[PDB]
Write a protein that binds this ligand. Structure first.
Ligand code: A1IQF
Ligand code: A1IQF
Lengths: 264, 264
């Protein structure tokens, strides 16, 4: 493709990225750094401030169970279900995606949303915590990591990944292409027609390659390093699923079957 | 960043070292597998009878035992030879022997297995694998049908090789790819990540140039090749988890070299 074509693809995905997701990376950076002297976020650092925070921000996943670590865990689910729809709608704007076989569209989203949620979560994290509720709350890493039994071990790898991933210093225009590449992976099991998916992903890769050289001209092999990250993501997604397994085996949680179906 | 003539020079140096370190190249393996030549023709092992003949015809460097064990011990003896050859090749990678000595050990520890699988693909097609420096050929069917846990042990190698070989890399490409794997600054416990990444950055530049010149019509071969370093990460873990099972069922001896590598 000609370079103006790639530049157009990049700006199309960036524009669509901005409209699809509730809090961009640029905004989240302004919050985490204190740069905006605007309203400081409500900080959740312990049990009492989690109580006060629910009552203040009036969270939408409230009145679920009772144990605090569980409540937090299930609010991670609530946000993930939301994220899934946000990525699904973003997908529709990747050139060519809607023209794929409907089953292949569903297969790509199904196996990809986990990796994308991990990635975008890093935009909302620093070494000390994570923005929640469109940047209005900030929940500390230490309070998450110190949750009881397995829940503490479940939250901390997200921060461990995010800190490493954020060292790349990608911005939203970088991430919008990167997200698209993940979605268009032709190696997802059960794809009926791999060829047009790789054809799209090749245009996306070309666009990401050129976007990274223009936007990070002094970051050698940033393209390569970012693809290596896409390696890890596969691994962390697998570790993650084997960790949701133990909780359902050991703790076994909610009862409302309808609720469980939404989170199926 | 380097000048192109310096990148071409590093590719030539690496290809020359690979030829000196690895006696059975992909080019020689492909000539044996394609045939159309009388002198290079392998004896084929597809069942117990041909295995028995096989040991009377081709010179196995691997001496009353049950057959799957006997084949297992054949691979591990050959894996140890491969570690030896890979170690010698690593030392030729510029900058490698100047790294901290425990980093050298750590990079080999986590890198040899990924390299063995990569170079095993050169010896394979969909129907089986070359053995004993190309003097023999053992069918995939025969390995797949071995008993207990040993049949399902041999088979994931073949599944990776068929996918990897679709890239159609030759030895000059593989020589630089093998090096990129070794100089991975993300291995657990590395003490000086930075000088390792500076070497890999150079190796990645060399691979990028090499793949564009040698495969000028292969869109995003670079990106696709880097995405294979993913699967590799997962088949290595699947391998060591299978080796874990066999230990608890078999008493099969592990070479001291391999015994130390498997250890965390
Ligand atoms: O806003 C956002 O874009 C956002 C996207 C994600 C999380 C998140 N997901 N998650 C997961 O385990 C997870 C992952 Cl990664 C991927 C797929 C599925 C799941 C899940 F859940 F289903 F298992 C986390 C684990 C730890 C942490 Cl710290 C965060 C997450 C997110 O956390 C906000 C959580 C929260 C808690 C209390 C109140 C309000 C919000 C925000
Ligand atoms: O020539 C070569 O470069 C070559 C490199 C590797 C194998 C190989 N290793 N291997 C392993 O299990 C293995 C791995 Cl990958 C890595 C570390 C440790 C081990 C092990 F053993 F300790 F557990 C295999 C499993 C299945 C298959 Cl098909 C091949 C391998 C290789 O096998 C064929 C050679 C052979 C020699 C004598 C008798 C029978 C076969 C050749």
């Amino acid at each position: 493709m000609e370079s103006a074509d790639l530049r157009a693809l990049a700006k199309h995905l960036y524009d669509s990225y901005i409209k699809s997701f509730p809090l961009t990376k640029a905004k989240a950076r302004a919050i985490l750094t204190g740069k905006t002297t605007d309203k400081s976020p409500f900080v959740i650092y312990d049990m009492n401030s989690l109580m006060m925070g629910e009552d203040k921000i009036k969270f939408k996943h409230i009145t679920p169970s009772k144990e605090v670590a569980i409540r937090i865990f299930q609010g991670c689910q609530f946000r993930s279900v939301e994220a899934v729809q946000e990525i699904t709608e973003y997908a529709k704007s990747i050139p060519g995606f809607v023209n794929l076989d409907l089953n292949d569209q569903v297969t790509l989203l199904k196996y990809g949303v986990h990796e994308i949620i991990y990635t975008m979560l890093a935009s909302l994290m620093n070494k000390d915590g994570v923005l929640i509720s469109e940047g209005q709350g900030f929940m500390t890493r230490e309070f998450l990591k110190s949750l009881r039994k397995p829940f503490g071990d479940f939250m901390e790898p997200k921060f461990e990944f995010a800190v490493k991933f954020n060292a790349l210093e990608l911005d939203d225009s970088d991430l919008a292409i990167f997200i698209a590449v993940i979605i268009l992976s032709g190696d997802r099991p059960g794809l009926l027609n791999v060829k047009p998916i790789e054809d799209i992903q090749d245009n996306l890769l070309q666009a990401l390659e050129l976007q990274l050289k223009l936007n990070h001209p002094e970051s050698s092999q940033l393209f390569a390093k970012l693809l290596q990250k896409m390696t890890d993501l596969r691994q962390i997604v697998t570790e993650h699923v084997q960790l949701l397994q133990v909780i359902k085996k050991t703790e076994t949680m909610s009862l409302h079957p309808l609720l469980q179906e939404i989170y199926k």
